[PDB]
Design a protein around this nucleic acid. Structure first.
Length: 1514
RNA sequence: UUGAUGUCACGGAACAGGAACUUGAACAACAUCGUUAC
């Protein structure tokens, strides 16, 4: 009696799902239950557990079909086939039921009786409505297989929705709702049961009503009927716990996260600046110990091929899930026609669609993606943007509140017939991240940890598009043909960070159509194939569409206006990006910003200049101009007031009216690399020995590096006359030269040359008119000097001459601040003109071996060679960087004003060497040994030396190898004294006995039992017959008159003397079995040390015999070859040489034997005495001057000992229960306790942060946490080069020939601080002196000797300029006080006799420049620039009346500075050169170093004969 | 896994704000080794 109907709906768009509720709050009063009534539901079996499946109710489908049929019945006047329907009844007297009512103004037709329930045949509409177990029953709809998922977060993910205001366009209350994806759950199934006694055509109405409905729950439907990442995540917490670097993790949470593009990106991580496989973050926490220590470049290479993380589908998720771990640690009518507008819209700029699901944070800003990582733009965004672009056509913001009778304004009648689809973008590449800091407007440096990220989607993504509007008006309404034309121009600002230039789509290749539904032949063809919503129907409809969008009727002037921007630079450029600096290949420290654009399926890079950076520059430029009742706009809070910044650029309570965009370079620029270094002040050399580089884009004055972009100002900001002025003013400054664009501007990066905008009918480009003063005054000349020295000939001088500072550094002024331009100070530019007078060198260290021979293979693998350089060129245009001209002027400006040492290495404690001859200090070392634990030393009593390496005895074999290392005590036979004879007491008084040594002789009986070959044996008693001995007298030419005849029993009166003799032997000497004890103690050898190797065949080696032997492979084998003193068999040697042509010599034929340990007398090793020994072992091994062999090397350097053990012997030094110094051998180097930083004063150490204050040369040039008020610039050559030595080939005067320099080895700070105790402070600042010694290098000689220099792999072959070249550069300053400008001009131009010095190899004669300050122009208001060249003689005179208030009359350091900058003017040849070591090895014979440590520069005349500048060394 | 005589949720832009900036001449001379003799 009943029939069935099996239907199934399919979705074409992600539908929406509501939340589960407890089954008592499903009432009418629950505010959240309604508002989710129209969404698909979620039913969980076993209540109190989130496990179930999604299901769609049936009453909802019923209401949708009722609405569709009610709509379809008014298109045909209320007739299905032949009979007519009744208006239907929708009344009820039970209002407490019916949880929700209808508020819709139901469509009308055929007003007549609604045929009340007292009838027996209703109108078919009342049959479908179900008026009187049911008549037509609607069954539920759920998934086909009825599966059972485990929660609402298993099928689709929740996200938040929005509701913005219109006037102040930010936002208000929000709401959230799930949304299941339609490509993983696209089908539902159910059933409708129909009685038989309903009708024969109500079924027809029902089928048509089904085919006419299209949306159920926020989607377009068509109803049809017939684990390495878990082990790695914490393994790299242990490698950070194995150190104390926890500030280096927020960046490692980001550098690895960016590897989610491809796997091959990890096989190219960078390496050290030298090239070894070491870094500062890819090799955190790895030492020599444990070679098997897995390193981060290895635990990532052991994740690239593991069969689970091979393909990118899981590789990307691997990095995403690994990076999220290292951050939680760092946290704590009957007219109706339907229009079909198809087409597509592409993205012209990177867009951003906000999607915060629940936590998702890790960046606190993410983009909206599909479940399989394709980009998508919702339909809620498109609809909310159409509403905004409609409320702008009209001038009426819709005031519809939430709830109630539907609104009826002009724009809510057009938003009631719109239907929009979604998009997928079919590109699925991962998004990139964009950092965005915030700069403190008081110090030019980033604020307190203000740094937050965001990720953006690429540009060039093609989305599909489709739209439909069905209504009464013929075709589209007037207010919708203009909006689509706005979007056709390219002004579709869809969503994202608008104020930074995000998404701007442009509708391409539009079409349209117009179907009519009020007829009866077209409508049936509309219902036949389900409109044209499906995939097949859309393609078939895509061949009936007439190209071209229609034309509007009332156009109304889009609300944004594009303004162009074009910028020319003249210098390099760099915009920082730190994370690319970590994962790159080259390994440079800081790199430039680069962005990718999606070509359509792949990504390619382009250099650019961010839009946030450009927004910030202009925003800060506008801020300093404005006064705003005294206090400027750079200190306000922007809370509830209308600023002039708070109105153009917006704030947190509204939105701005200007949208900047990225700027591109309109060429093909390629980065370069520039090395840098820090030149220490005292002992001028590379501090810390490490360099640091950066990669800018190469600008020039000939190739000016164009930039071109755009930005969009609103319409009603242009028309005003107050904001356009405030934008023209602050663009006229950006044009004049202030506000450099980019990074390291202090050394000349950025420095915009021009800026010209257009597209504003000269409404803004009206205050950018330049007007330059031209009062032509000549610059005053440099005053004549008075510092006179008296240089005579035939006397040689020295090249360093430190400058003793004063002792009062003034740090009592509060820094100014880079906010509003202060009024008492100056701001402008200086144009200089540098001219060299002695060949200059500035090397281009991009490549070595520039001076290469012809046809020679490049290199092989890893080898040393002759490094040949070239002059510094940028674009085949000889220049000089700004970092060179900054460190030259700053080091002279900070000594004129006597300020804090700006860079000075406060580490590297010093180490002198023991005094060889001095026995007063080399006596207090009391041999001992550290105890069983490394905490105490138990001394010894006395020592004696046991001979080895000789040809008398054997000790190498007959002793075992467990006691020649000093851990098994050994019995030995000592002899504290030896007994010397004499037999003629009165026959030696004149010929000897004049030396107070024969003061203990007692008696003697010349017994005799054996006569040797040349010896006379004697068994003589000493006192009375109780104590005798055996010994062998060495006869002389005064005894054979008393030993003229032997009788084997003679007796004669002789004499015995007891002499000092300290030796020890194994058992007993063969020659003398006299009184010898047998004591007990350890024994240690330090090996066969004390070698004196050379190449010149000294006196001892030339006193050999012939065929000198080779060097042995290992010791325990070395013996003695010859004697030093050959008359008496005294101190032996060992003379040998290898085949390389190198000669050795070897003393030390003995080793010391300890004995007589003393217990219950020990001392403690504190931690202070532990640093000195940890340090001393560093200096033995890393010795470039060490022996080329290793047999002759000492024990500590040979065995690479790195710390003191338990069972080892040392030579400690102590007092009162504490030890102070340890030393491995008898004579070896000491180390002071304090570091080198504590030898200066307390006010001369480098300036710290902020009280203490800031030294004066810290307030002009910057520091950390303060920005410098002076910028330099690249200097460029203007005449022709005029090389020093003619080039290899004539014709081209742009390449010079090479010259060969000398050694130039490192500077030693012990020749200046030779003492150690308390009175050896640090001298001044090491200024080199001016002279002419390059006339000798140019010929190829040596500055000290006269010999020629032969090339060796430690000297460079540079090309240099000559005397008589000119350069030009600029110096831009701001906020300088009046007197600081005086001393800066003083430090630039010196008096007429003086000269600066820059370059390389200036210890010889190389590099002498002098500067002449030309035109100086100031700046007073944004209009005029006041060429104030005629006021210098007041600044020069007011900067010298300040140096007289600080240091009243004690300016004697300035007259010592002025004697080092003195130039040898004419007919003077001051000969300066470094002394050699010995006098015997230089042909001139000028008293080398060994004769200088006694005599003139002994040890108390070195901090006095190195401070007075021009001291004649001779 | 609802209910029937009544659901404008295609009835609601996760929007608004923030300069990866500051500091640094690619430069450079005095030694290294341990004891030997009485």
């Amino acid at each position: 009696m009943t029939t069935t109907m099996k239907i199934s709906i399919e979705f074409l768009e992600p539908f929406r799902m509501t939340k589960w509720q407890e089954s008592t709050r499903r009432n009418k009063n629950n505010k959240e239950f309604v508002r989710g009534q129209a969404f698909a539901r979620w039913h969980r079996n076993k209540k109190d557990n989130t496990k179930g499946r999604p299901y769609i109710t049936g009453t909802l489908l019923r209401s949708a079909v009722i609405r569709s049929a009610e709509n379809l019945l008014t298109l045909s006047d209320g007739k299905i086939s032949e009979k007519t329907c009744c208006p239907g009844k929708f009344d009820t007297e039970d209002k407490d039921r019916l949880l929700q009512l209808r508020q819709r103004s139901t469509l009308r037709w055929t007003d007549k009786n609604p045929c009340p329930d007292n009838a027996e045949t209703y109108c078919p509409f009342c049959e479908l409505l179900g008026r009187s177990r049911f008549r037509i029953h609607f069954g539920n709809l759920s998934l086909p297989g009825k599966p059972d998922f485990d929660g609402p977060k298993a099928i689709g993910s929740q996200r938040v929705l929005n509701r913005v205001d219109f006037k102040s366009g930010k936002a208000h209350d929000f709401f959230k709702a799930y949304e299941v994806d339609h490509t993983r759950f696209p089908r539902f199934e159910g059933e409708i049961t129909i009685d038989n006694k309903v009708s024969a055509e109500a079924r027809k109405l029902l089928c048509d009503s089904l085919k006419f409905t299209d949306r159920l729950c926020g989607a377009l439907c068509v109803i049809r009927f017939d684990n390495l990442a878990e082990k790695t995540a914490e393994q790299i917490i242990s490698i950070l716990d194995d150190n104390k670097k926890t500030e280096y993790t927020r960046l490692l949470a980001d550098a690895i996260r960016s590897l989610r593009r491809s796997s091959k990106l990890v096989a190219g991580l960078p390496k050290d600046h030298d090239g070894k496989d070491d870094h500062y973050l890819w090799d955190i926490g790895k030492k020599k110990k444990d070679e098997n220590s897995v390193t981060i470049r290895q635990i990532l290479t052991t994740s690239a091929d593991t069969k689970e993380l091979k393909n990118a589908g899981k590789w990307r998720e691997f990095c995403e899930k690994l990076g999220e771990a290292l951050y939680l640690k760092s946290k704590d009518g009957s007219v109706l026609k339907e229009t079909v507008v198809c087409g597509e819209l592409v993205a012209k700029t990177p867009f951003f669609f906000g999607a915060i699901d629940e936590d998702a944070k890790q960046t606190d800003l993410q983009v909206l993606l599909t479940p399989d990582n394709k980009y998508r733009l919702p339909r809620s965004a498109v609809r909310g943007i159409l509403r905004r672009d409609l409320q702008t056509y009209f001038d009426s913001p819709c005031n519809a509140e939430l709830g109630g009778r539907p609104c009826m304004c002009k724009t809510c009648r057009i938003m009631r017939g719109i239907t929009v689809m979604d998009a997928r973008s079919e590109y699925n590449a991962p998004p990139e991240i964009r950092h965005r800091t915030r700069i403190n407007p008081f110090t030019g440096t980033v604020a307190e940890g203000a740094l937050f990220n965001m990720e953006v989607a690429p540009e060039g993504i093609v989305f599909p598009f489709q739209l439909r509007y069905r209504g009464s008006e013929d075709g589209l309404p007037d207010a919708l043909k203009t909006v689509l034309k706005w979007w056709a121009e390219g002004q579709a600002f869809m969503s994202g960070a608008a104020s930074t230039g995000k998404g701007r789509f442009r509708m391409e290749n539009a079409k349209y159509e117009t179907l009519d539904l009020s007829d009866e032949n077209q409508r049936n063809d509309y219902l036949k194939n389900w409109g044209w919503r499906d995939e097949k129907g859309l393609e078939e409809l895509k061949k009936r569409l007439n190209s071209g969008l229609p034309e509007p009727g009332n156009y109304r002037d889009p609300k944004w206006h594009e303004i162009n921007v074009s910028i020319e630079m003249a210098s390099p450029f760099i915009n920082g990006d730190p994370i690319r600096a970590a994962v790159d290949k080259r390994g440079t420290d800081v790199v430039t910003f680069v962005k990718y654009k999606a070509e359509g399926e792949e990504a390619k890079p382009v250099c650019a200049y961010k839009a946030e950076s450009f927004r910030g520059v202009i925003r800060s430029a506008v801020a300093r101009i404005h006064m705003e009742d005294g206090v400027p706009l750079t200190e306000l809070t922007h809370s509830d007031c209308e600023c002039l910044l708070c109105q153009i650029f917006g704030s947190e309570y509204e939105a701005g009216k200007i949208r900047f965009e990225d700027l591109v370079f309109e060429s093909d620029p390629e980065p370069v690399t520039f090395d840098h270094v820090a030149i220490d002040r005292f002992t001028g050399g590379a501090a810390d020995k490490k360099k640091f580089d950066d990669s800018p884009l190469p600008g020039s004055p000939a190739r000016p590096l164009m930039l071109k972009g755009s930005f969009w100002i609103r319409r009603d900001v242009l028309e005003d006359e107050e904001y356009c002025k405030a934008l023209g003013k602050a663009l006229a400054d950006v044009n004049n030269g202030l506000y450099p664009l980019g990074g390291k501007s202090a050394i000349g990066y950025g420095q915009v040359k021009s800026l010209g905008i257009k597209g504003d009918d000269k409404r803004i480009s009206r205050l950018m008119n330049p007007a330059f003063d031209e009062t032509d005054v000549a610059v005053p000349e440099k005053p004549k000097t008075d510092a006179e020295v008296r240089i005579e000939a035939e006397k040689v001088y020295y090249p360093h001459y430190f400058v003793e500072p004063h002792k009062k550094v003034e740090r009592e002024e509060k820094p100014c601040g880079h906010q509003k331009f202060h009024e008492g100070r100056l701001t402008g530019k200086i144009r200089c003109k540098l001219i060299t007078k002695t060949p200059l060198i500035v090397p281009d260290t991009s490549n070595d071996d520039f001076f290469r021979p012809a046809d020679k293979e490049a290199r092989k693998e890893k080898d040393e060679y002759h490094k040949s350089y070239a002059f510094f060129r940028l674009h085949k245009q000889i220049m000089i960087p700004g970092s060179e001209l900054r460190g030259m002027v700053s080091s002279v400006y900070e000594t004129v004003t006597n300020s804090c040492f700006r860079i000075f290495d406060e580490t590297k404690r010093l180490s002198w060497r023991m005094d060889a001859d001095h026995q007063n200090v080399l006596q207090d070392f009391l041999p001992g040994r550290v105890t069983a634990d490394g905490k105490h030393i138990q001394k010894f009593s006395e020592t004696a030396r046991v001979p080895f390496y000789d040809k008398t005895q054997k000790h190498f074999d007959i002793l075992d190898e467990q006691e020649i290392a000093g851990e098994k005590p050994v019995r030995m036979w000592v002899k504290r004294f030896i007994k010397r004879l004499s037999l003629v007491d009165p026959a030696k008084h004149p010929q000897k006995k004049q030396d107070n040594k024969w003061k203990r002789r007692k008696e003697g009986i010349a017994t005799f039992i054996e006569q040797k070959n040349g010896s006379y044996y004697f068994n003589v008693v000493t006192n009375n017959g109780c104590t005798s001995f055996h010994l062998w007298h060495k006869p002389d030419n005064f005894d054979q008159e008393k030993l003229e005849g032997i009788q084997n029993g003679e007796k004669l009166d002789c004499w015995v003397r007891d002499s000092r003799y300290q030796k020890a032997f194994q058992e007993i000497p063969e020659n003398d079995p006299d009184g010898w004890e047998c004591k007990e103690g350890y024994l240690h050898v330090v090996g066969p040390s004390k070698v004196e190797f050379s190449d010149k065949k000294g006196d001892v080696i030339n006193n050999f015999q012939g065929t000198l032997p080779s060097v042995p492979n290992d010791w325990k084998t070395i013996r003695t070859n010859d004697f030093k003193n050959r008359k008496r068999k005294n101190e032996p040697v060992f003379c040998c040489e290898d085949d390389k042509g190198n000669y050795y010599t070897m003393a030390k034929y003995c080793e010391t034997f300890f004995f007589d340990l003393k217990e219950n007398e020990e001392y403690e090793i504190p931690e202070k005495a532990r640093i000195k020994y940890k340090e001393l072992l560093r200096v033995y091994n890393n010795n470039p001057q060490a022996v080329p062999e290793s047999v002759f090397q000492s024990r500590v350097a040979r065995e690479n000992v790195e710390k003191l053990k338990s069972g080892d012997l040392v030579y400690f030094k102590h007092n009162e229960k504490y030890v102070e110094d340890i030393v491995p051998v008898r004579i070896s180097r000491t180390v002071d306790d304090r570091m080198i930083g504590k030898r200066m004063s307390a006010d001369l150490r480098p300036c710290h942060g902020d009280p203490k204050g800031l030294c004066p040369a810290c307030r002009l040039f910057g520091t950390g946490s303060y920005k410098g008020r002076v910028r330099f610039g690249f200097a460029s050559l203007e005449n022709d080069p005029e090389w020093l030595i003619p080039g290899k080939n004539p014709g081209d005067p742009f390449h010079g020939g090479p010259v060969m320099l000398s050694l130039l080895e490192r500077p030693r700070p012990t020749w200046s601080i030779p003492g150690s105790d308390n009175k050896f402070k640090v001298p001044g600042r090491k200024f080199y002196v001016h002279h002419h010694a390059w006339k000798t290098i140019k010929d190829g000689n040596h500055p000290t000797t006269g010999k020629a220099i032969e090339q060796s792999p430690n000297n460079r072959t540079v090309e240099a300029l000559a005397g008589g070249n000119s350069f030009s550069f600029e110096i831009a300053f701001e906020n300088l006080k009046e007197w600081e400008l005086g001393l800066l001009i003083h430090s630039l131009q010196l008096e007429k006799g003086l000269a600066h010095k820059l370059g390389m190899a200036k210890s010889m004669g190389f590099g002498s420049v002098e500067i002449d300050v030309e035109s100086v122009r100031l700046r007073k208001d944004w209009k005029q620039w006041r060429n104030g060249n005629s006021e210098i003689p007041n600044w020069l005179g007011k900067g010298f009346a300040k140096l007289k208030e600080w240091f009243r009359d004690e300016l004697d350091f300035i007259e010592n500075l002025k004697k080092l900058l003195w130039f040898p003017e004419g007919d003077q040849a001051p000969r300066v050169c470094y002394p050699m070591l010995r006098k015997k090895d230089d042909p001139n014979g000028n008293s080398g170093y060994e004769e200088l440590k006694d005599g003139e520069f002994k040890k108390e005349d070195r901090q006095k004969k190195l401070t007075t500048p021009w001291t004649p060394w001779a």
